[PDB]
Design an enzyme around this catalytic site. Structure first.
Site, PDB file in Angstrom:
ATOM      1  N   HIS A   1       0.600  -1.121  -0.317  1.00  0.00           N
ATOM      2  CA  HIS A   1      -0.195   0.270   0.193  1.00  0.00           C
ATOM      3  C   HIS A   1       1.364   1.453   0.143  1.00  0.00           C
ATOM      4  O   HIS A   1       1.593   0.760  -0.350  1.00  0.00           O
ATOM      5  CB  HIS A   1      -1.002   0.126   1.304  1.00  0.00           C
ATOM      6  CG  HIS A   1      -2.258  -0.928   1.104  1.00  0.00           C
ATOM      7  ND1 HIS A   1      -2.104  -1.698   1.854  1.00  0.00           N
ATOM      8  CD2 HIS A   1      -2.205  -1.925   0.348  1.00  0.00           C
ATOM      9  CE1 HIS A   1      -3.674  -2.603   1.868  1.00  0.00           C
ATOM     10  NE2 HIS A   1      -2.481  -3.720   0.376  1.00  0.00           N
TER      11      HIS A   1
ATOM     12  N   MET B   1       0.961  -4.429   3.354  1.00  0.00           N
ATOM     13  CA  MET B   1       0.879  -5.584   2.786  1.00  0.00           C
ATOM     14  C   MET B   1       2.169  -5.764   2.483  1.00  0.00           C
ATOM     15  O   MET B   1       2.576  -4.346   1.524  1.00  0.00           O
ATOM     16  CB  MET B   1      -0.246  -5.693   1.559  1.00  0.00           C
ATOM     17  CG  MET B   1      -1.664  -6.790   2.032  1.00  0.00           C
ATOM     18  SD  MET B   1      -2.467  -6.273   0.406  1.00  0.00           S
ATOM     19  CE  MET B   1      -3.880  -7.394   1.526  1.00  0.00           C
TER      20      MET B   1
HETATM   21 CU   LIG Z   1      -3.295  -4.618  -0.747  1.00  0.00          CU
END
Ligand SMILES: [Cu+2]
Ligand SMILES: [Cu+2]
Ligand code: NI
EC number: 1.14.17.3
Length: 312
Positions: free
Chosen positions: A200, A270
Site C-alpha cells: 500500500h 501488505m
Molecule cells: Cu493490499
C-alpha cells in the site's frame, strides 16, 4: 458499446477452444476510487487451460483490473464491493491489467490449468475505477477481460509463487522498516517469466531473488507505487530444489501517527511478491506460497539495490 447483450459471454473459437468474456454487469460507480468484483463459474466442468487474456477496459474510467481463479468467491449475486476481498478460499491471481503499464502475453505453449477435479471452478474479476469522469451520463460499464480457453493440454503450465509478509509492524515515523520473506524451494524446476509487486502507500521498494550457494540472482525489483502490473523478468530465471527464494519490501512509517501492520485496508500494509512461472506439464504444480522467513541471517548479504528506491 461493449456490453455483450444477446450473444452472451461464450464465443466458440473452434472444436476445442472458446473465449469467455468476464465483464462487469453494466455497473455505475457512484464515488471515485471504487473496487468492484464479480464472478463467473467456468462453463465446462472438465479440465481446461487458459492460454490468453484480452483486456476489455474503458480507457477513460478503468485504472486497473485483476483476474483470479478460486472455488469460493466472497459473494454470490451480480457484483460486490471488494477493497481487495475477492475469495473466501485462496484467490489465485492469473492476470493483471494496469493503465500505463501494458500487459505482456503468456509465452506460447504455456497455460494455467483450471476446472476439472483440482483446478479453479470460478473466475473472479476485480475492477478498480478511480476517476469517475465520463460517468456524468450515468452510463453502464461492462469492462473486464476476454479469456481464451482450450481443452488441449499445454506442454507448459503457468503457476504462481506468492511471497507474502504476515507479521510486519511498522512503528509510526520510523524511517526504514524491512519486511523479509524466505523459503527453501522443494519442487521440480520452475522458470520465472513475470512478476508483480504489491504494497500500500508506505511501500518504497520490493525485490525478489533466487539464492543458490549464497549467490543472489534478481527475479524482479520494482517501486510498488508504480502501476502494479506483471512486468516481464529481464532474464529467465530457474528455481530448483535446494534454492532459497528471498524477498524484501522496504517500508517507511513517515506520515503515520500509529503503528501499521499487515491487513486488508489502506491504513494497513501488505508485502506481496507474485512470481509467475512455467513448469513442464508432467512436473507442474499450479501454486506455491511462502509466508515465512526461514533464513533471516542470509539477508545480511542481500544486494544493496534492495534497499535503494527506483528513481522516478
Ligand atoms: Cu493490499
Ligand atoms: Cu488501479
Ligand atoms: Ni532454464
Amino acid at each position: 458499446n461493449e456490453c455483450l447483450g444477446t450473444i452472451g459471454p461464450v464465443t466458440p473459437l473452434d472444436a476445442s477452444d472458446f473465449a469467455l468474456d468476464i465483464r462487469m454487469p453494466g455497473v455505475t460507480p457512484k464515488e471515485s476510487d471504487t473496487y468492484f468484483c464479480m464472478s463467473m463459474r467456468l462453463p465446462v466442468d472438465e479440465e481446461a487451460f487458459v492460454i490468453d487474456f484480452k483486456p476489455r477496459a474503458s480507457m477513460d474510467t478503468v485504472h486497473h483490473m485483476l483476474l483470479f481463479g478460486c472455488n469460493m468467491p466472497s459473494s454470490t449475486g451480480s457484483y460486490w464491493f471488494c477493497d481487495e476481498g475477492t475469495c473466501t478460499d485462496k484467490a489465485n491471481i492469473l492476470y493483471a491489467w494496469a493503465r500505463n503499464a501494458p500487459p505482456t502475453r503468456l509465452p506460447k505453449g504455456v497455460g494455467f490449468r483450471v476446472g476439472g477435479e483440482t483446478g479453479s471452478k470460478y473466475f473472479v474479476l476485480q475492477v478498480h475505477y478511480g476517476d469517475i469522469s465520463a460517468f456524468r451520463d450515468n452510463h453502464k460499464d461492462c469492462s473486464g477481460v476476454s479469456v481464451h480457453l482450450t481443452r488441449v493440454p499445454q506442454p507448459l503450465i503457468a503457476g504462481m509463487y506468492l511471497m507474502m509478509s504476515v507479521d510486519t509492524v511498522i512503528p509510526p515515523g520510523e524511517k526504514v522498516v524491512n519486511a523479509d520473506i524466505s523459503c527453501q524451494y522443494k519442487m521440480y524446476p520452475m522458470h520465472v517469466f513475470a512478476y508483480r509487486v504489491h504494497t500500500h502507500h508506505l511501500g518504497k521498494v520490493v525485490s525478489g531473488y533466487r539464492v543458490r550457494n549464497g549467490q543472489w540472482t534478481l527475479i524482479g525489483r520494482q517501486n510498488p507505487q508504480l502501476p502494479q502490473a506483471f512486468y516481464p523478468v529481464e532474464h529467465p530465471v530457474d528455481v530448483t530444489f535446494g534454492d532459497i527464494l528471498a524477498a524484501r519490501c522496504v517500508f517507511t512509517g513517515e506520515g503515520r501517527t500509529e503503528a501499521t501492520h499487515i491487513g486488508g485496508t489502506s491504513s494497513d500494509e501488505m508485502c506481496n511478491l507474485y512470481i509467475m512461472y512455467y513448469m513442464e506439464a508432467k512436473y507442474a504444480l499450479s501454486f506455491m506460497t511462502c509466508t515465512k522467513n526461514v533464513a533471516p541471517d542470509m539477508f545480511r548479504t542481500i544486494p544493496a539495490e534492495a534497499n535503494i528506491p527506483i528513481p522516478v
